[PDB]
């Protein structure tokens, strides 16, 4: 399959409570492999997956230096953006950054991304061509002009097409025993009467990786949305995911309903029907 590497940075100002809280996490697909937390005792980039632990001391030294430098840029940027939006020195604000690259099954570059937020809203984004920016507002237009003048796109493009894909390929090789797994969902259905005339059918998917999955209820082969509940896909905390979909049905009509399960790890999609 295709693979992705993504980094997620959060910087939160806490005026009068010291420098901003900076948290960085790194993912390959849905697997976290590193973290940095400005508040933690180590002051180091730290491993969060077994297959990254084999990286030598030079890896940890350089990752720590680079992520600390980015936490300092974000600290300065919180001050600049507070200025741009004419905000009080007293309020807490948040910068978020997501960047990364996708590779195909051949390990070759497909796409790169870099997107920044302020207070939970789009601020500035690197365009698909990795040569130009989209600003969300007039403050971000100021950033866009500074970034055009500094040729910031060129540095992002060189990383995203170079070190990003090169190191993603290396991680996919070092972690191949775990990162190339497709754990199919283990499924079951439950039945609970709600009244003398209605029952809940709940279709379960457990123990699957990656997270992407579709659960659909049909009645007589037609997609149902009314009287359904679909929960958000959730982590089990063991490297797998869980999801369920429920439908409320008339009592004695359970057999008209089918739950369809689609996942990368299934040779063919599964269909479950309430089996008395």
């Amino acid at each position: 399959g295709s693979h992705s590497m993504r980094y997620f940075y959060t910087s939160v100002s806490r005026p009068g409570r010291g420098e901003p809280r900076f948290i960085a996490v790194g993912y390959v697909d849905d697997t976290q492999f590193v973290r940095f937390d400005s508040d933690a005792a180590s002051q180091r980039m730290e491993p969060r997956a077994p297959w990254i632990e084999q990286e030598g001391p030079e890896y940890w030294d350089q990752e720590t230096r680079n992520v600390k430098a980015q936490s300092q840029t974000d600290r300065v940027d919180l001050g600049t953006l507070r200025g741009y939006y004419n905000q009080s020195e007293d309020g807490s604000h948040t910068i978020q950054i997501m960047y990364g690259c996708d590779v195909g099954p051949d390990g070759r570059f497909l796409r790169g991304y870099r997107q920044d937020a302020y207070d939970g809203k789009d601020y500035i984004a690197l365009n698909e061509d990795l040569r130009s920016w989209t600003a969300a507002d007039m403050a971000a237009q100021i950033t866009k002009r500074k970034w055009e003048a500094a040729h910031a796109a060129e540095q992002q493009r060189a990383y995203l097409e170079g070190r990003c894909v090169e190191w993603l390929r290396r991680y996919l090789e070092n972690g191949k025993e775990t990162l190339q797994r497709t754990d199919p969902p283990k499924t079951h259905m439950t039945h609970h009467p709600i009244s003398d005339h209605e029952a809940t059918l709940r279709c379960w998917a457990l123990g699957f990786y990656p997270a992407e999955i579709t659960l659909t209820w049909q009645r007589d082969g037609e997609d149902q949305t009314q009287d359904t509940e679909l929960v958000e896909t959730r982590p089990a905390g063991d490297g797998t995911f869980q999801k369920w979909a429920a439908v409320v049905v008339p009592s004695g009509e359970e057999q008209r309903y089918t739950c369809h399960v689609q996942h990368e790890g299934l040779p063919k999609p599964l269909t479950l029907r309430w089996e008395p």
């Binding site: 790194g26 890896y59 600049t80 953006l81 500094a150 070190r163």
Partner: peptide
């Protein structure tokens, strides 16, 4: 790895 930054 992380990226090798221009102030906003």
């Amino acid at each position: 790895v992380v990226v090798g930054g221009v102030g906003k």
